[PDB]
A = this chain, B = another copy of it.
Amino acid sequence: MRTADRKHRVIVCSQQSDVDDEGRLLITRAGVIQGWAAIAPVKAIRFSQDGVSMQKDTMQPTHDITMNYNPDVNVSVSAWVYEHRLKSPPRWFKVLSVVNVDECSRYMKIRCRLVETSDDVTPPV
């Protein structure tokens, strides 16, 4: 993939969770990586105004993310991708799996599932 295809600014996030004292749980999403990436859709999306995607299986990836490989980072089962745009609301991607493209260790292919896309999401800290 030509390096001009990477035209999205993403923030790869690892989530931490802690129980709320009143009885709930809270998921803190902090950024660990920020760079240029190229996204591509592999499925349509049901939006259900207020943004939350209405996918049923919650395990079929909808977007494929291509970015630069990094041998020391270990993209977990609990990684997120916060992609921010200029005049469109930000989007929260939840990773579903990674692909080491052709095992050349040049790019990672992160099968992700659109979580939602609205102007009232919590940016990462």
Contact = CB atoms under 8 A, between A and B. Distances in A.
A85 B69 CA distance: 15
Nearest to A118: B74
Interface in A4-60: 8, 39-41, 43-49, 51, 54
A73 to B, nearest CB: 10
A46 B103 contact: no
B100 A46 contact: no
Contacts of A46: 77, 96-97
Contacts of A39: 103
A100 B103 CA distance: 22
A88 B76 contact: no
A34 to B, nearest CB: 19
Given A40-B102, A46-B96, A49-B77, A88 B71 contact: yes
A99 interface: yes
